Amino acid sequence: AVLKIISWNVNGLRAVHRKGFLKWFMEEKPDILCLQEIKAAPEQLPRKLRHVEGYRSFFTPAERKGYSGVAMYTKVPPSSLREGFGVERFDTEGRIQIADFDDFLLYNIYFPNGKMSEERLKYKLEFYDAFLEDVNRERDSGRNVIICGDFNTAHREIDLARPKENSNVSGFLPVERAWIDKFIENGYVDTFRMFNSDPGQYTWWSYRTRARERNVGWRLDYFFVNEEFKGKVKRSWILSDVMGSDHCPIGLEIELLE
Template structure:
């Protein structure tokens, strides 16, 4: 992180005191008193940025004062970005657009300007769908991803599994380079039976297929932690509800939106939440608070 997060420039040594001792100054270092700053991130599949902007999205964002807000399914092209959508006081915005109009797309609104921002992870057939923005915050890389949905056809399921595998290998490459990942977004898969209301009815439905869930297992085994489950082991916590069946009112949903962190970052994690009361999309926001 940069210094405008207001960390002590001597954070590695703890609190620094300057004491007057006659004709000289003495530097006193207290190693156990280290101040931290909370870094709050929200992630939300908004199902259309222009639509949710009319439902109070920016008012919500500015009220909550998140340091970073990651969006999926923005469904907006570069030629459709207005000043209102791009220039928000106190934030810098980064977008990745799909070549197909009105489809996919991700965005990051951030108070802290990253060292570097990448659109995608270097594979054209995935990057052309505008599914990934990766921001380098120094202490960690934040990957905001809209993972593919496999329900439309066998071909799209195959594409989803290829995307999964490509990202897993990319994450392993970053680990070998000594980089630590925070991954957020819509994974389009409920990992375990506790993560959806009717698991027995959905074993043959994309989003809960054995091969999709197996990939989630392998992603965890590669060193990534599901932050919500660090703090909450209970059932009936979901992030997506079908809009046509009044499912949200009945809380018949799926938990498919996540924050994963590399295990090396676990001590930085302080809180992970599902903001089910926040309306405006068929998904709700999820959040992560880090101590930096």
């Protein structure tokens, strides 16, 4: 048995629902679907959004209504979920689900966008720092870990269409890219790069100026695993053609212990 995980920053769950979300979900049939940018009070949702037959759903909203928020649909419920790193300023923005499954912990993370200001940038970097503390503790415990979501940073030049013009733009700052380097050096693997070494492989395009059509995009969304688990990763891919958000979904297929 394999387990398929999809991660998708949906740019608002209500928004994506109006653009083919449930048809896609039913057709893709992931075992686990991690979503970011729900932008909805979980109670405000129609029961066919938050209920999808065959899945347990778990929603982790921000304190601020209509902002941020993550969600997980899973056929098999986790033994529990954590909704934070145990650090209150990173825990109230609806960015964190850490779901405890059998073979592994699944971090479903909506990493902060650092573009709006220097405060938001510091926020993002410290969020990164607290994330790294969290995940290291868990896999140091002996947990195999899968981390997915919107990292809001393109790692290397290959990871976006315009590395030069974005050198001093949050998303592609040396400091941000250096964090992913450090993250990787702690024994985590960017799984997409395990199987696909190609350029032009992105997960986000600006809605504007035909960015998706000109493939002017960034790979902002990732699946990382710890080194010790990478042997279990069978596939890691971008669902490039799936529409309805400014991000496309990304996929991970892993093989379960019998």
